[PDB]
Amino acid sequence: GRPEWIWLALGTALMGLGTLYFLVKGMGVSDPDAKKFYAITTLVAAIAFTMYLSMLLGYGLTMVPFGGEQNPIYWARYADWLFTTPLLLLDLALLVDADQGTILALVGADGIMIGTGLVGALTKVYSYRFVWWAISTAAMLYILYVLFFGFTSKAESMRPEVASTFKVLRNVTVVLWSAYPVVWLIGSEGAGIVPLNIETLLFMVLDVSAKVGFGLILLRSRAIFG
Numbered sequence: 001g002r003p004e005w006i007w008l009a010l011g012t013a014l015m016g017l018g019t020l021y022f023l024v025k026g027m028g029v030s031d032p033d034a035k036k037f038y039a040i041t042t043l044v045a046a047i048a049f050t051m052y053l054s055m056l057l058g059y060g061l062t063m064v065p066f067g068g069e070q071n072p073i074y075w076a077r078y079a080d081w082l083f084t085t086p087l088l089l090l091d092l093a094l095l096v097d098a099d100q101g102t103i104l105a106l107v108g109a110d111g112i113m114i115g116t117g118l119v120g121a122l123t124k125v126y127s128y129r130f131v132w133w134a135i136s137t138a139a140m141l142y143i144l145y146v147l148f149f150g151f152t153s154k155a156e157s158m159r160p161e162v163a164s165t166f167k168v169l170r171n172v173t174v175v176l177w178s179a180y181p182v183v184w185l186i187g188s189e190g191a192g193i194v195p196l197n198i199e200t201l202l203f204m205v206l207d208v209s210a211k212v213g214f215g216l217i218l219l220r221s222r223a224i225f226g
């Protein structure tokens with residue numbers, strides 16, 4: 001019964017409830033466009049629910065040696081984010097009608113971000129763990145640059161309702177995503193300053209906010225209608 005399980009149980013519950021609500025509401029809408037957003041967003045919550053559940057049950061956890069200790073690394077997180085982060089970017093891209101090349105470059109950068117992030121979380125040479133972390137953060141900053149400079153401009157061709165909805169989602173995304181590299185840096189994966197139970201609480205608040213929070217804002221808006 002690890003100290004962080006209570007936060008994993010609360011995360012499972014919140015992701016589960018969000019998944020159900022998104023599923024029920026999406027199943028009733030007939031609009032084709034509205035449906036796309038509902039399917040993507042419900043999938044994002046569903047994947048998070050399953051991974052929180054797996055971790056709650058003892059999976060996705062491995063001891064990596066470094067800094068003279070056996071460090072508890074929850075790798076199930078990257079299995080979640082590998083698929084949920086680019087899906088969230090997809091929601092945003094579809095909202096502003098971004099083009100093919102942009103989406104591909106964004107998803108590719110997102111793949112690098114999660115990939116190098118996991119390599120770093122598994123690296124046994126302490127200093128190198130931060131080399132990988134640095135590359136992952138640079139990848140994330142590219143994504144945030146594109147969402148802020150590129151997309152916002154693209155939402156210029158949209159109607160107030162949609163441009164308005166994108167800004168809120170963009171703002172929530174930029175604030176939440178920018179927090180992840182800091183939590184990693186000071187937590188179990190990096191400096192080991194913040195204990196795993198508190199770190200798990202921090203990631204749970206961020207995850208739930210970035211998926212269920214983002215989802216509620218997105219799905220209740222009129223901008224999802226084609």
Ligand SMILES: *C/C=C(C)/C=C/C=C(C)/C=C/C1=C(C)CCCC1(C)C
Pocket residue numbers: 048081084085088113114117118133136137138140176177178180181184207210211
């Ligand atoms: C539902 C999950 C979301 C929206 C997750 C977002 C996760 C990030 C923006 C993660 C970023 C990371 C870095 C910038 C570097 C270190 C490792 C990561 C993967 C924690």
